[PDB]
């Protein structure tokens, strides 16, 4: 699998592929690895499917309980800290998962958490089997003076490179830009196909 998360000026963009295997044997050509975890932050998936979905369910539950107790959204440092403490209360029966949570509260963030609960701030991050490819292209092309359209084009070029050069990733890309103004918006697949055909990465 692969993930990507890119922080720019006043937004943060995350995207995954949708191919679940679960065997060698690619079994599901349309899964779901990008989740809305709250109204201003989301969470991606790059690990064992069952453990990752249980962590998504628990974090949806805990953040909704949080916002319903305090009427304020959770800070991104707080959600990564909570996720780190949860993953590190059990590490000798651990969750084989590589999580990545990003979102905006007063400034956009994207955080990475490994299977032992190591939280660390960075402006662009990625996890999964097809991770070094998207790190390569993000290192080569990424600038922090981009717009939202330039950011999502960079994301689509990244995940397209990972699909062309990796076995585990593949299938249709789904992308969701989360910003302070419009809130959590997941792009429809028709606009994503339009961006792919505009960039000329289709075959």
């Amino acid at each position: 699998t692969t993930t990507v998360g890119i922080t720019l000026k006043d937004a943060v963009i995350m995207a995954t592929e949708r191919r679940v295997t679960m065997e060698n044997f690619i079994m599901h050509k349309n899964g779901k690895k990008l989740f809305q975890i709250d109204t201003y932050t989301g969470m991606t998936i790059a690990g064992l499917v069952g453990d990752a979905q249980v962590l998504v369910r628990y974090m949806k539950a805990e953040l909704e309980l949080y916002r319903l107790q305090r009427r304020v959204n959770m800070p991104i440092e707080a959600v990564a800290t909570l996720l780190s403490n949860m993953l590190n209360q059990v590490k000798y029966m651990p969750y084989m998962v590589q999580l990545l949570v990003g979102g905006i509260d007063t400034a956009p963030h994207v955080f990475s958490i490994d299977a032992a609960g190591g939280s660390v701030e960075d402006i662009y991050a990625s996890t999964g089997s097809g991770s070094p490819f998207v790190y390569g292209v993000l290192e080569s092309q990424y600038s922090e003076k981009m717009t939202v359209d330039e950011g999502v084009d960079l994301v689509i070029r990244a995940i397209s490179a990972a699909k062309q050069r990796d076995s585990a990733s593949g299938g249709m890309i789904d992308v969701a830009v989360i910003t302070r103004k419009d809130g959590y918006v997941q792009l429809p697949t028709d606009q994503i196909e339009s961006r792919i055909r505009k960039l000329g990465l289709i075959l």
Partner: protein
């Protein structure tokens, strides 16, 4: 000589301790709500206190989910602990079934909790009544959960000190499927006719939901219209 323990009936066969908890509910301020054409609302009277009070933490209406909400009356201590258990049971419900499918068994969990404490010695019951409200897979819902643990789902009620007068009004005036505004104003008139002479109805918190939407709380100036 029998109204001392939670575990003893009278020779008539009554639980005077449970009924005294129901009396302790009666000392709290009136709060009502009804469902209408695609959704439910709630209304809660608040005699406006010390202006030092930040309004954020005197809301008798509380959001247990984006799709379930409720209101209390009675012992504010037990009230708060109850709305906490409502939230936590909503979370456990939502995670073992993917979503809050039925509001009814959220109210069941809360009612079984309030039930048990009417039974065992060394415990007193909760002196609070709760009026849950929301949207589920079935549609608009509106329960009321009393100290003993009776649940009766309504499409309108009150609780609190006015409850008899408000349900008396609604029992002879309320007509279902009103468009939201007209419903609210009927409920405001219901709340009005429960006060005593000379008392002027201050600004009450009111909030609603419609089918396919989340909650919203009318802010004080949207409330101010219906005065």
């Amino acid at each position: 000589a029998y109204d001392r323990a939670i575990t003893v009936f009278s020779p008539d066969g009554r639980l005077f301790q449970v009924e005294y908890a129901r009396e302790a509910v009666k000392k709290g301020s009136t709060a009502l709500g009804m469902k209408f054409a695609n959704g439910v609302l709630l209304i809660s009277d608040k005699k406006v206190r010390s202006r030092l009070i930040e309004q954020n933490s005197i809301e008798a209406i509380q959001l247990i989910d984006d799709y379930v909400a409720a209101v209390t009356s009675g012992l504010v201590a037990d009230a708060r602990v109850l709305v906490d258990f409502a939230r936590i049971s909503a979370q456990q419900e939502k995670v073992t079934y993917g979503s809050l499918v039925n509001i009814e068994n959220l109210v069941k969990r809360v009612a079984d909790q309030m039930q048990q404490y009417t039974q065992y010695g060394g415990v007193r019951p909760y002196g609070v009544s709760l009026i849950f409200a929301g949207i589920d897979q079935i549609g608009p819902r509106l329960f009321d959960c009393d100290p003993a643990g009776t649940i009766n789902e309504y499409k309108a009620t009150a609780i609190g000190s006015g409850k008899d007068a408000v349900v008396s009004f609604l029992e002879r005036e309320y007509k279902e499927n009103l468009p939201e505004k007209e419903a609210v104003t009927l409920g405001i008139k219901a709340l009005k006719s429960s006060l005593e002479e000379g008392e002027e109805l201050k600004a009450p918190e009111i909030a609603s939901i419609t089918v396919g939407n989340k909650y919203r709380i009318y802010d004080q100036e949207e409330v101010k219209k219906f005065l």
